[PDB]
Coordinates of C-alpha atoms in Angstrom, one line a residue:
X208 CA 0.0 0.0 0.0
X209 CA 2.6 2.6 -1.1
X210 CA 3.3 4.9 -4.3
X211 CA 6.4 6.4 -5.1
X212 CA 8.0 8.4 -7.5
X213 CA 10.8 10.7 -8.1
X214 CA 12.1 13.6 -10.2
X215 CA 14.9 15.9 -11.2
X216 CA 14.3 19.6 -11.7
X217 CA 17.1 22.1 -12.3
X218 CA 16.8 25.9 -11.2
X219 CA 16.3 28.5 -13.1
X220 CA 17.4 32.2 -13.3
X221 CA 14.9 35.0 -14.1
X222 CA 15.8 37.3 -17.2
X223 CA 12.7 39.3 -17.3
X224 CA 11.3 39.4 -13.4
X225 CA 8.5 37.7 -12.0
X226 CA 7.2 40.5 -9.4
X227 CA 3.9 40.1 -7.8
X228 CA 0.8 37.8 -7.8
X229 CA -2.8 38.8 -9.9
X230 CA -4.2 35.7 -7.5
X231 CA -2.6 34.3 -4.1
X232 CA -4.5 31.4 -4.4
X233 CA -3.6 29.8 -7.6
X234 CA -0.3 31.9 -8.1
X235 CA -1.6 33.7 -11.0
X236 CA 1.3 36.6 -11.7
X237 CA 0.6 40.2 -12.7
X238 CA 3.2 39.6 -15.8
X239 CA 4.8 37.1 -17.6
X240 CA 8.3 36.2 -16.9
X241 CA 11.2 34.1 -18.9
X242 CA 14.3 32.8 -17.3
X243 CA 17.2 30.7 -18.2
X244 CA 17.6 27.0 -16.9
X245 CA 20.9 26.1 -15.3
X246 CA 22.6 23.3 -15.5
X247 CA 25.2 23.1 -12.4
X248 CA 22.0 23.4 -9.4
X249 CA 19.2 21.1 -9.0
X250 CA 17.2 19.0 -7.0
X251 CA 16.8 15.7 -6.9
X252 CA 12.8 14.7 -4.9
X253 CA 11.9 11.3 -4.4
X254 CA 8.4 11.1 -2.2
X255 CA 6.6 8.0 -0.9
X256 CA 2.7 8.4 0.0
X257 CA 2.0 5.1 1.9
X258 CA -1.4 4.2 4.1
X259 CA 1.0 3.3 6.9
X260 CA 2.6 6.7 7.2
X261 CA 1.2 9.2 10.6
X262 CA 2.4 11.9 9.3
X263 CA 4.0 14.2 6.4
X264 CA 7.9 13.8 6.6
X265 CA 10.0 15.7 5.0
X266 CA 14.0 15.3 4.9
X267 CA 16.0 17.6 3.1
X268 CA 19.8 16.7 2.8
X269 CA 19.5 13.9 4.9
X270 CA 18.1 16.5 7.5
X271 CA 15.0 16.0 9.1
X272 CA 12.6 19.4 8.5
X273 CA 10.2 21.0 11.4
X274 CA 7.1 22.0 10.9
X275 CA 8.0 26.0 9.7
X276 CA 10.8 24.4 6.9
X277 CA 7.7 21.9 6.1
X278 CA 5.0 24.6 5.3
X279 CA 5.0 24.8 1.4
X280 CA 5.8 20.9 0.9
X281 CA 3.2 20.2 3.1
X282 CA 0.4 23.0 1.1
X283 CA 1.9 21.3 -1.9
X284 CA 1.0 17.6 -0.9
X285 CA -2.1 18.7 0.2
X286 CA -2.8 19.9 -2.9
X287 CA -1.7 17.4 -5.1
X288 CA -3.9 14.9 -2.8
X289 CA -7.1 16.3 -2.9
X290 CA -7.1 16.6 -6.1
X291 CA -5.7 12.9 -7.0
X292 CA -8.7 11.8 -4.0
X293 CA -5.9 10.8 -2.1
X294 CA -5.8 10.2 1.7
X295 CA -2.0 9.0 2.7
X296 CA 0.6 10.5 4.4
X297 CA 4.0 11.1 2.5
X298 CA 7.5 10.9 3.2
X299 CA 9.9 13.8 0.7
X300 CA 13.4 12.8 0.3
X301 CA 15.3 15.6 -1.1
X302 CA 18.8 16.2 -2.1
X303 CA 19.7 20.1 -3.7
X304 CA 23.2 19.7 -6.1
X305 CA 25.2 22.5 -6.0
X306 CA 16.8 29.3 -6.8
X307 CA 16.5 26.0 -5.0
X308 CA 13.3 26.5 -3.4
X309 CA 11.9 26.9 -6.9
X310 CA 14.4 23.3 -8.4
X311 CA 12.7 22.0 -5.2
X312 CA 9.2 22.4 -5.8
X313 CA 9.6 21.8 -9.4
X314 CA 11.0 18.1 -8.5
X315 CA 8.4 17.6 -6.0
X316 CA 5.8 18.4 -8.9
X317 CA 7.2 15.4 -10.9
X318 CA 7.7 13.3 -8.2
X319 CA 4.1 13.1 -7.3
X320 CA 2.8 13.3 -11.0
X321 CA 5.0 10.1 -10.8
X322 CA 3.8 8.9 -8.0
X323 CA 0.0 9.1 -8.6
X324 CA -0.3 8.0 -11.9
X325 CA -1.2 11.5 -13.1
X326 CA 0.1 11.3 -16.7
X327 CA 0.9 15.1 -16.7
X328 CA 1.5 16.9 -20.1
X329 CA 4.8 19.0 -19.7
X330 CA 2.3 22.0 -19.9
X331 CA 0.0 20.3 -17.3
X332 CA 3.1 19.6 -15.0
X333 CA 3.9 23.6 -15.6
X334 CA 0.8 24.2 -14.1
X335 CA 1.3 22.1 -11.2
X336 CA 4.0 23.3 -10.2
X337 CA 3.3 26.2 -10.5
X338 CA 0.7 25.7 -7.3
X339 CA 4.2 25.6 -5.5
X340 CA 6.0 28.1 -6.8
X341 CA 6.0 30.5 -9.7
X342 CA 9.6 30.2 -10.7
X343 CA 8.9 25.9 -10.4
X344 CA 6.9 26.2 -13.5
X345 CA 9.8 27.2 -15.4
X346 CA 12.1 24.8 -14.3
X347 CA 9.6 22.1 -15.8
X348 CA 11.6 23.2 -18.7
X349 CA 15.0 23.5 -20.2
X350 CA 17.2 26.7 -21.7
X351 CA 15.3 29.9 -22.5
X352 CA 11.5 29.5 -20.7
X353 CA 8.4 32.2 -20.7
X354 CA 5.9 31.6 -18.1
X355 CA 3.1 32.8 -20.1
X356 CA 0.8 34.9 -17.1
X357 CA -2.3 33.8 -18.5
X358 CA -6.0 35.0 -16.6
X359 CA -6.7 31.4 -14.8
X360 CA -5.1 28.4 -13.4
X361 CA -5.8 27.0 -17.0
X362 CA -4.1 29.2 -18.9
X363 CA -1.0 30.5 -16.8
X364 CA 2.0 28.0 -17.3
X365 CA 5.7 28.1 -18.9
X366 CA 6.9 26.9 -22.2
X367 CA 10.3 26.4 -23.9
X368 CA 11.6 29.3 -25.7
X369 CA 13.4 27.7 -28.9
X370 CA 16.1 29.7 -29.5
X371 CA 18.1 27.9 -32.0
X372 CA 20.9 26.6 -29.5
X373 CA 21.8 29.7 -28.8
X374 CA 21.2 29.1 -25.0
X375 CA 24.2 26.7 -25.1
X376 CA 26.6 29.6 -26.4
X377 CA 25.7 31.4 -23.2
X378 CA 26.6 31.1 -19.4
X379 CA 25.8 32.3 -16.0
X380 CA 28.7 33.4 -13.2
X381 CA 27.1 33.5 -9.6
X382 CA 28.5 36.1 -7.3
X383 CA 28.1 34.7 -3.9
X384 CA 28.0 37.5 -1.2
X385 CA 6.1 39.6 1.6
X386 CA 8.3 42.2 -0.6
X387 CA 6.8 40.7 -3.4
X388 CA 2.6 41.6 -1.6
X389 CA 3.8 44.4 -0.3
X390 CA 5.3 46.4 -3.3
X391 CA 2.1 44.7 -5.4
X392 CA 0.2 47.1 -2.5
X393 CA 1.6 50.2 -2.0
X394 CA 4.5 51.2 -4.5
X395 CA 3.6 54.2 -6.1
X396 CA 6.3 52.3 -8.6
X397 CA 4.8 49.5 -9.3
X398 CA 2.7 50.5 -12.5
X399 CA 5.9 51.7 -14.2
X400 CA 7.4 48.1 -13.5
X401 CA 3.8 46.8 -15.2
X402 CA 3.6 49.2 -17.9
X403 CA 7.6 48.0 -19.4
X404 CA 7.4 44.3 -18.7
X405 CA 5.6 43.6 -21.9
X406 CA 8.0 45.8 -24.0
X407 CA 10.9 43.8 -22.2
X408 CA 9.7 40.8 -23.4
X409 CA 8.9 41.6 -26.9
X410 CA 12.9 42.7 -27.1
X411 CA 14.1 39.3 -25.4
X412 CA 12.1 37.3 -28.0
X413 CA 13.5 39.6 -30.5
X414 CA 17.2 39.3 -29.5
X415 CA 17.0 35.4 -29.2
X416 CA 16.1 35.2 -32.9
X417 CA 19.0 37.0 -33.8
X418 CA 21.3 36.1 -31.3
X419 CA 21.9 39.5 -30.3
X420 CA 23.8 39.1 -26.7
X421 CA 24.5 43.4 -26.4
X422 CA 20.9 43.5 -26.6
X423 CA 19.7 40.7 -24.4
X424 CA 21.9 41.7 -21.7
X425 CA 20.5 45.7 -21.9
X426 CA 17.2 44.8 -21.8
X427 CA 17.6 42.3 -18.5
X428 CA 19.7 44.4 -17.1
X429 CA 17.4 47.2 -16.7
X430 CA 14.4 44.9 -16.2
X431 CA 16.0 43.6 -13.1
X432 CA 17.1 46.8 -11.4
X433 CA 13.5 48.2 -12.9
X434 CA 12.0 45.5 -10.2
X435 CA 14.6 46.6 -7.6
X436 CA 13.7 50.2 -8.1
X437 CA 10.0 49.2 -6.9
X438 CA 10.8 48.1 -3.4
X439 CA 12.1 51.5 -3.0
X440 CA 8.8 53.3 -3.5
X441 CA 7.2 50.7 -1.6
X442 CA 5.5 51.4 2.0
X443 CA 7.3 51.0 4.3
X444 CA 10.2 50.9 1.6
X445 CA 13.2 48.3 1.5
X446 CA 15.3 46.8 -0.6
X447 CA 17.4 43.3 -1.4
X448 CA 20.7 44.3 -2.2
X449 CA 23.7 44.7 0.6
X450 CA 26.8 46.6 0.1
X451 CA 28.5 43.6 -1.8
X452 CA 25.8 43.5 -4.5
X453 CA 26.4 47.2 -5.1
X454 CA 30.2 46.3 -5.8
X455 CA 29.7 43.5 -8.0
X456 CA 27.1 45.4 -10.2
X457 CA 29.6 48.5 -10.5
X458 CA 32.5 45.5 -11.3
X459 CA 30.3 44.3 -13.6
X460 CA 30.2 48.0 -15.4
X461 CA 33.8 48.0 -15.4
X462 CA 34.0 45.1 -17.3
X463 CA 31.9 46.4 -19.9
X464 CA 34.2 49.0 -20.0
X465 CA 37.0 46.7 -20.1
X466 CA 34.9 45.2 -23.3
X467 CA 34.1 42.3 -21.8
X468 CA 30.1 41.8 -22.5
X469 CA 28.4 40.8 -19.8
X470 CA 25.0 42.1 -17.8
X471 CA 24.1 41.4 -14.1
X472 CA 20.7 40.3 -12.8
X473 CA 19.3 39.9 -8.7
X474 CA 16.4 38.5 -7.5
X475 CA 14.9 38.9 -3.8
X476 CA 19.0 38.6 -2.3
X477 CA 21.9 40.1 -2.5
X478 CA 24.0 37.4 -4.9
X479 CA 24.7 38.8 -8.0
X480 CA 24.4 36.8 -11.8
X481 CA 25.8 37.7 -14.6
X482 CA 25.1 36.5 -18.3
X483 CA 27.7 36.3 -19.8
X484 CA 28.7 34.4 -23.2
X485 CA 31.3 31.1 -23.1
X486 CA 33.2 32.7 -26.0
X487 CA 34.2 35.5 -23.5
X488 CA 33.3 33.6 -20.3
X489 CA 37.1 32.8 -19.5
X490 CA 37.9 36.7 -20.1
X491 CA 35.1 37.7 -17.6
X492 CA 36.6 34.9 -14.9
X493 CA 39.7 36.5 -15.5
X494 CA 38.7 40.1 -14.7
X495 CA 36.6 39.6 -12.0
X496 CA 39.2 37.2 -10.6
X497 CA 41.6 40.5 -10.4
X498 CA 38.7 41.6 -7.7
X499 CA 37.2 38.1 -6.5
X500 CA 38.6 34.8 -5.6
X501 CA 37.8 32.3 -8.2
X502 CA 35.9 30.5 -5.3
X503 CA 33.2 33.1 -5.3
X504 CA 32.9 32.7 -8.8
X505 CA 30.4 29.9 -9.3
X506 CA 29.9 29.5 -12.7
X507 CA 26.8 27.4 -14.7
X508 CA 25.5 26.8 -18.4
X509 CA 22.4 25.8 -19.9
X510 CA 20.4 22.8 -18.2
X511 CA 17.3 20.6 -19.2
X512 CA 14.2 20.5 -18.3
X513 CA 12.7 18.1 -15.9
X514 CA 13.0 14.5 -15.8
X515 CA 10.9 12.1 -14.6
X516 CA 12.4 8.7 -13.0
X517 CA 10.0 5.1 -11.4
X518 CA 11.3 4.4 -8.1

């Protein structure tokens, strides 16, 4: 009397933001977003659902979670059973390889569509996952990604952005060093952010069919300090970066100046990424090695999309 099932899901790095929620309860975003899956961090999930369980477990790195580190697994599985009619307990094994929060839930999604028996369509998983986390429905996918924002829990999911392999001419180097609600509520900036995302998008899409890096790398460059700027006119206002991140972005500058192309992104922390292409990836490593030691330089390519495994 047990099911089990397991996955493999790969996180993913926003190009064009996704920043704030249309619906809470279904995760429905205000805008469509498109990220980049990675190849060097993911998540492996395994979960059991067995009528002799007592209770949701769930064991992270060989670590036993509490009840606060359980919270979104536990909505998740809860989700997932009612709507497969099913009444057993589960145990989640899960192992990150190294954002993760979002490789995490992704995995989890396949591992109970596994599982279950659900027989999900890779748009259908998207959707799933989604339940758990917005940037999980883009790691159901490899390479370049939109999450489409849709107006229902039908119609908002992610696809695969073909881009004619340009994805693996590309790479990512990691600079290691409520916000969302409350800037969709009160920032008096938040309609700007709306009112550009669209525009963004269009120049991404454009870019990737002429594999036109300079370009890609303006246009997510300013999206993502466009989101940052919100958090500023928020109430009360805040933001994610620390003194680091503002070093590495102006480093980042320099080496643009330096004519090395490259762009920086940050999402809701202060670590800093930056696209920058494998042709001049080694020229990048080596310039921001003058500054940083190559050990805080974590560096990643392309990655798939999910994959599926029987226990």
């Amino acid at each position: 009397a047990m099911l089990s099932g397991k996955a493999r899901a790969h996180t993913n790095i926003a190009l064009i933001k996704y920043w704030g929620k249309a619906n809470e309860e279904y995760i429905l975003p205000m805008n469509s977003s498109l990220s980049l899956t990675l190849d060097a961090f993911y998540t492996e999930t395994t979960v059991t659902f067995d009528a002799h369980y007592s209770e949701d477990v769930f064991i992270l790195n060989g670590i036993l979670q509490n009840e606060k580190q359980t919270k979104k697994v536990k909505e998740f599985l809860n989700l997932v059973r009612q709507q497969a009619d099913c009444t057993w307990f589960a145990k989640v094994e899960s192992q990150n390889f190294v954002a993760s929060s979002a490789s995490g839930l992704a995995a989890l999604a396949g591992a109970c569509n596994v599982a279950l028996g659900l027989n999900l369509s890779a748009k259908d998983l998207s959707r799933l996952a989604r339940r758990g986390s917005g940037s999980a429905c883009r790691s159901i996918f490899g390479g370049f990604a939109q999450w489409n924002k849709g107006h229902s829990d039908e119609t908002s999911f992610a696809e695969n952005i073909p881009a004619n392999n340009w994805e693996n001419e590309l790479a990512m180097l990691f600079i290691l060093i409520d916000g969302m609600k409350r800037t969709v509520e009160t920032s008096s900036f938040y309609q700007g952010w709306l009112d550009n995302v669209e525009k963004d998008l269009s120049q991404v899409h454009e870019a990737i069919k002429t594999k036109d890096f300079p370009r890609l790398g303006e246009i997510i460059e300013a999206n993502g300090l466009r989101m940052h700027g919100t958090t500023l006119g928020a109430v009360p206002p805040f933001t994610y970066w620390s003194p680091g991140s503002l070093q590495a972005m102006a480093l980042v500058r320099q080496a643009r100046a330096k004519g090395i192309p490259c762009y920086f992104t940050m999402d809701a922390g202060p670590n800093v990424k930056v696209l920058v292409e494998k042709k001049n990836l080694e020229a990048l490593k080596t310039f921001l090695s003058e500054h940083f030691s190559k050990e805080q330089l974590v560096p990643a390519f392309a990655g798939p999309g999910i994959e599926l495994f029987e226990t």
